[PDB]
């Protein structure tokens, strides 16, 4: 079915994601610089067609970089790539939409993003800071209205500027909202959420599929495990004793075996990785299988414990992990 050479998935809208894809985020900070570009260059040359950035990880520009150099020395063209960019809190007031995707496109030197999302359901105040916080280092929010930055999302796509728009941290409320709005024009075909076997999310799964959106496993490798904003009440997920015991079974390592878990169910993995061996490790999951008794024996592996919490922003209107799914 799947294969290293052609794992593309198709989107509700007519268009196609590869199935794995490359995660940027990387704590900039202790992260060296072109460390992102050289990264998205030695993917593509392992065979890596999709990339997954965010103008607020800082690098987007390295990635751009790198897919710029890889489409000029034909390696592959532009229709071959899919970028996937992201929409954060401080800029979904409507006017703001068009203007921070171009900015994108800017910072890409590119014509259009394969994907855009809402990167989070929850507005913040707009402006420079991506992180908006008074002096008693109190968050600045603002009123989210899903509804109406989603109009500003199709807007961009009838524009041409991008293929196919979606959101991420989306719960099955806020999910309704944008597919039972009056007039819809595009709806969204992805929503980027939490998904490893410690967290399979089997409701908010089936109820995407019921819609025909696929679901994007961000952190699916259990993410860094960074105690800054990472929940680790949960053990090590690539420690795991049956994810290790089945990677023996088929000389895989755990990473391998739980990315295989997700694609095997239909769901799109985005690991990421700066380091040239554990790229090409994560790639190679076309060359087996797990039966239907290990797939039910990884889900049941699930625990409902997210690593990813954002716990600072439960009190936010629109926060999403309040609700079962
Ligand atoms: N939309 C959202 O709200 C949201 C939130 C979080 C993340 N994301 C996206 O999802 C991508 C993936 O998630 P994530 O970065 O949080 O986490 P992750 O992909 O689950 O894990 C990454 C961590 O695993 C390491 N790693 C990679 N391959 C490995 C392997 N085979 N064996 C052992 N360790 C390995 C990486 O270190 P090395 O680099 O040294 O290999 C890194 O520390 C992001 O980079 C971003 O593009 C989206
Ligand atoms: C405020 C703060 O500490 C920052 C540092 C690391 C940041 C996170 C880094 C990873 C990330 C990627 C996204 O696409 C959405 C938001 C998140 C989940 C970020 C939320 C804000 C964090 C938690």
Redesign the pocket.
């Given at each position: 079915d799947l294969s290293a050479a052609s794992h593309r998935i198709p989107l509700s809208d007519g268009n196609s994601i590869p199935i794995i894809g490359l995660g940027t985020?990387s704590?900039p900070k202790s992260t060296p610089k072109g460390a992102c570009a050289t990264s998205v260059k030695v993917a593509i040359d392992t065979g890596y067609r999709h990339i997954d950035g965010?103008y607020?990880?800082q690098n987007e520009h390295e990635v751009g970089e790198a897919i710029r150099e890889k489409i000029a020395e034909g390696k592959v063209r532009r229709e071959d790539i899919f970028y996937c960019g992201?929409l954060w809190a401080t800029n979904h007031v409507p006017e703001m939409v068009r203007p921070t995707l171009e900015r994108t496109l800017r910072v890409l030197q590119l014509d259009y993003v394969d994907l855009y999302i809402i990167?989070?359901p929850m507005a913040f105040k707009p402006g420079d800071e991506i992180?908006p916080r008074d002096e008693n280092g109190k968050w600045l929010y603002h009123k989210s209205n899903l509804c109406a930055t989603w109009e500003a999302m199709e807007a961009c796509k009838d524009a041409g500027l991008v293929k196919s728009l979606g959101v991420?941290?989306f719960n099955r409320r806020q999910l309704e909202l944008i597919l039972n709005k009056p007039g819809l024009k595009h709806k969204p075909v992805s929503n980027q959420v939490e998904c490893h076997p410690y967290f399979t999310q089997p409701k908010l799964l089936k109820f995407c599929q019921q819609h025909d959106i696929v679901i994007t496993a961000?952190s699916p490798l259990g993410t860094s495990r960074?105690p800054?904003?990472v929940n680790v009440s949960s053990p090590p997920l690539l420690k795991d004793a049956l994810l290790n015991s089945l990677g023996k079974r088929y000389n895989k390592t755990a990473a391998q075996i739980v990315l295989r878990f997700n694609i095997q169910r239909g769901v799109v993995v985005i690991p990421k990785s700066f380091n040239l061996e554990r790229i090409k490790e994560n790639f190679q999951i076309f060359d087996f299988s797990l039966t239907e008794e290990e797939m039910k024996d990884i889900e049941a592996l699930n625990k409902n414990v997210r690593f990813?919490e954002?716990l600072?922003w439960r009190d936010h209107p629109e926060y999403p992990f309040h609700d079962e799914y």
């Open positions: 985020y704590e965010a607020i990880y992201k990167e989070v992180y991420s941290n961000y960074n800054i904003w990813v954002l600072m």
